[PDB]
Amino acid sequence: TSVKILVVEDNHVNQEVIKRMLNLEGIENIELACDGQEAFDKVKELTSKGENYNMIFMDVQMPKVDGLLSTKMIRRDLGYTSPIVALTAFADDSNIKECLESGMNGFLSKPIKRPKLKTILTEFCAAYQGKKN
Amino acid sequence: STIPSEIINWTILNEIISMDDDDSDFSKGLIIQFIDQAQTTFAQMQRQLDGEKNLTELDNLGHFLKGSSAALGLQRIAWVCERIQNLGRKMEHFFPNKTELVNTLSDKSIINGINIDEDDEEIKIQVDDKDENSIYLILIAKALNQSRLEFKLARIELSKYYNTNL
Numbered sequence: 524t525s526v527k528i529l530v531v532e533d534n535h536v537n538q539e540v541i542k543r544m545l546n547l548e549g550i551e552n553i554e555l556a557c558d559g560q561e562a563f564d565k566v567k568e569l570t571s572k573g574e575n576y577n578m579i580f581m582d583v584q585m586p587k588v589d590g591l592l593s594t595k596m597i598r599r600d601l602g603y604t605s606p607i608v609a610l611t612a613f614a615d616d617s618n619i620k621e622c623l624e625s626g627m628n629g630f631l632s633k634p635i636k637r638p639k640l641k642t643i644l645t646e647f648c649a650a651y652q653g654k655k656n
Numbered sequence: 657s658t659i660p661s662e663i664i665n666w667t668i669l670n671e672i673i674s675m676d677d678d679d680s681d682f683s684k685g686l687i688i689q690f691i692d693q694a695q696t697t698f699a700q701m702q703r704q705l706d707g708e709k710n711l712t713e714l715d716n717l718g719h720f721l722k723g724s725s726a727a728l729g730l731q732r733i734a735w736v737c738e739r740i741q742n743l744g745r746k747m748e749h750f751f752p753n754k755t756e757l758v759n760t761l762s763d764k765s766i767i768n769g770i771n772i773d774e775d776d777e778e779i780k781i782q783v784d785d786k787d788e789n790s791i792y793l794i795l796i797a798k799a800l801n802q803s804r805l806e807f808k809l810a811r812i813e814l815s816k817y818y819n820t821n822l
């Protein structure tokens with residue numbers, strides 16, 4: 524607890540890599556969603572408790588509900604005011620523009636490297652405290 | 657884009673390995689998971705090519721394997737996956753011949769004791785029943801045959817690194 528992050532990602536290999544990277548950054552409270560509907564549902568449940576996820580990392584292509592539609596639902600239907608950052612195998616400027624215009628705050632392309640994750644967390648992640656040689 | 661010359665981007669894979677801490681079960685475990693995922697995904701793509709011929713599903717499968725191969729530094733596999741995605745989206749209109757792509761290898765001699773066409777499968781597609789979508793399907797089949805070769809090459813390099821058949 525303290526920092527709480529949602530990783531939305533249909534590929535289990537990618538889930539496991541970002542989870543380990545976040546753990547190494549001292550963040551242990553990581554939840555996983557496999558598609559955009561599950562993401563909506565989880566943010567929706569936490570919405571009741573009266574707390575945000577500090578951050579959501581959102582994949583774009585996923586079955587059932589993709590990350591663009593997921594973001595739209597989370598923004599529009601739920602309160603949601605905290606950061607959502609695309610984390611995706613995309614790509615080019617069309618994809619980045621689309622993600623930002625859908626209500627995502629930022630954009631990371633896979634592979635995500637540890638130093639770049641550090642920068643995103645410092646930028647966007649509320650209670651995050653980072654080290655350090 | 658030009659396909660990367662190196663089968664493994666060691667900058668990325670070394671970073672994955674650096675997260676092991678203690679025995680190597682994390683990184684080797686991801687390699688093993690990826691290998692399985694690749695076999696499942698190739699079978700799925702082949703099933704589409706032979707059956708429903710759904711370009712959107714082929715694009716989703718390409719994009720799926722792209723993310724995992726890229727995260728493990730298997731950058732030639734990731735590149736061919738990206739081509740499949742774009743072909744499935746009708747956003748590309750060619751795919752290079754296997755000879756051109758094997759000639760870009762940095763360790764160009766890695767292609768010496770294996771049959772580069774061994775894992776090739778032919779697309780069951782009439783001509784006969786040909787239409788505006790036929791090229792994309794046939795170029796994705798071409799790309800998948802390349803992908804199976806790139807997968808075998810990555811397995812060779814990985815098996816050599818691990819000193820064990822993966």
Ligand code: BEF
Nearest residue numbers: 582583584611612
């Ligand atoms: F499927 Be995600 F966009 F990498």
Ligand SMILES: [Mg+2]
Nearest residue numbers: 533582584585
């Ligand atoms: Mg995905």
Ligand code: NA
Nearest residue numbers: 577578579605
């Ligand atoms: Na958030």
